[PDB]
mmCIF file of C-alpha atoms in Angstrom:
data_model
loop_
_atom_site.group_PDB
_atom_site.id
_atom_site.type_symbol
_atom_site.label_atom_id
_atom_site.label_comp_id
_atom_site.label_asym_id
_atom_site.label_seq_id
_atom_site.Cartn_x
_atom_site.Cartn_y
_atom_site.Cartn_z
ATOM 1 C CA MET A 1 57.425 5.941 8.514
ATOM 2 C CA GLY A 2 55.383 6.010 5.334
ATOM 3 C CA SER A 3 53.432 8.799 3.266
ATOM 4 C CA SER A 4 50.331 7.557 1.406
ATOM 5 C CA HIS A 5 50.498 10.625 -0.947
ATOM 6 C CA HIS A 6 48.503 9.739 -3.496
ATOM 7 C CA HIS A 7 45.315 7.906 -2.578
ATOM 8 C CA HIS A 8 42.064 7.219 -4.829
ATOM 9 C CA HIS A 9 38.759 7.591 -5.095
ATOM 10 C CA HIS A 10 35.598 6.320 -7.222
ATOM 11 C CA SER A 11 31.957 7.365 -7.882
ATOM 12 C CA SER A 12 29.179 4.556 -7.523
ATOM 13 C CA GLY A 13 25.834 5.820 -8.717
ATOM 14 C CA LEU A 14 22.572 3.600 -8.806
ATOM 15 C CA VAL A 15 18.935 3.393 -8.017
ATOM 16 C CA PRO A 16 17.643 0.832 -5.912
ATOM 17 C CA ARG A 17 13.428 0.090 -6.091
ATOM 18 C CA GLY A 18 10.943 -1.839 -4.054
ATOM 19 C CA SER A 19 7.620 -3.275 -5.819
ATOM 20 C CA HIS A 20 4.889 -6.090 -5.151
ATOM 21 C CA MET A 21 1.320 -6.872 -6.237
ATOM 22 C CA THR A 22 -1.756 -8.348 -4.584
ATOM 23 C CA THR A 23 -3.720 -5.782 -2.827
ATOM 24 C CA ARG A 24 -5.619 -7.440 -0.240
ATOM 25 C CA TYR A 25 -8.363 -5.202 1.612
ATOM 26 C CA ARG A 26 -10.287 -6.440 4.097
ATOM 27 C CA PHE A 27 -13.295 -5.170 6.460
ATOM 28 C CA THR A 28 -14.789 -6.067 9.362
ATOM 29 C CA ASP A 29 -17.462 -3.502 8.951
ATOM 30 C CA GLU A 30 -20.055 -4.092 6.056
ATOM 31 C CA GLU A 31 -19.689 -0.283 5.498
ATOM 32 C CA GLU A 32 -16.194 0.150 5.088
ATOM 33 C CA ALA A 33 -16.720 -3.161 2.823
ATOM 34 C CA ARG A 34 -18.936 -1.249 0.737
ATOM 35 C CA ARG A 35 -17.333 1.826 0.571
ATOM 36 C CA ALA A 36 -13.815 0.401 -0.243
ATOM 37 C CA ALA A 37 -15.980 -1.261 -3.398
ATOM 38 C CA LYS A 38 -17.681 1.925 -4.381
ATOM 39 C CA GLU A 39 -13.753 3.958 -3.844
ATOM 40 C CA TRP A 40 -12.580 1.665 -6.234
ATOM 41 C CA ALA A 41 -15.483 1.459 -8.531
ATOM 42 C CA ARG A 42 -15.191 5.175 -8.657
ATOM 43 C CA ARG A 43 -11.316 4.526 -9.446
ATOM 44 C CA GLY A 44 -13.002 2.029 -12.184
ATOM 45 C CA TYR A 45 -11.099 -1.384 -11.122
ATOM 46 C CA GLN A 46 -13.492 -4.291 -11.031
ATOM 47 C CA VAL A 47 -14.519 -5.314 -7.340
ATOM 48 C CA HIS A 48 -15.937 -8.169 -5.640
ATOM 49 C CA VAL A 49 -17.095 -7.833 -2.146
ATOM 50 C CA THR A 50 -16.088 -11.509 -0.251
ATOM 51 C CA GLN A 51 -18.004 -12.023 2.890
ATOM 52 C CA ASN A 52 -15.891 -14.879 3.676
ATOM 53 C CA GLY A 53 -16.868 -14.811 7.221
ATOM 54 C CA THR A 54 -17.142 -12.439 10.114
ATOM 55 C CA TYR A 55 -14.908 -9.966 8.451
ATOM 56 C CA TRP A 56 -16.466 -8.967 4.893
ATOM 57 C CA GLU A 57 -12.956 -8.306 1.983
ATOM 58 C CA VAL A 58 -13.155 -6.616 -1.180
ATOM 59 C CA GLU A 59 -11.108 -7.922 -4.399
ATOM 60 C CA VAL A 60 -9.944 -5.572 -6.122
ATOM 61 C CA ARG A 61 -9.149 -6.165 -9.844
#
């Protein structure tokens, strides 16, 4: 026999966060690569369409 008649409590309060740069957009279709380049251009970002191979990428700077 034994009564825990004074239990204790605390109060934890924090905010976590997740973030990362380097947003690599790559397209297989030429028109989707040109649309992305034009969409980011309208957004005011400096872009470069890199035809690396069979897939045409869009550098977002």
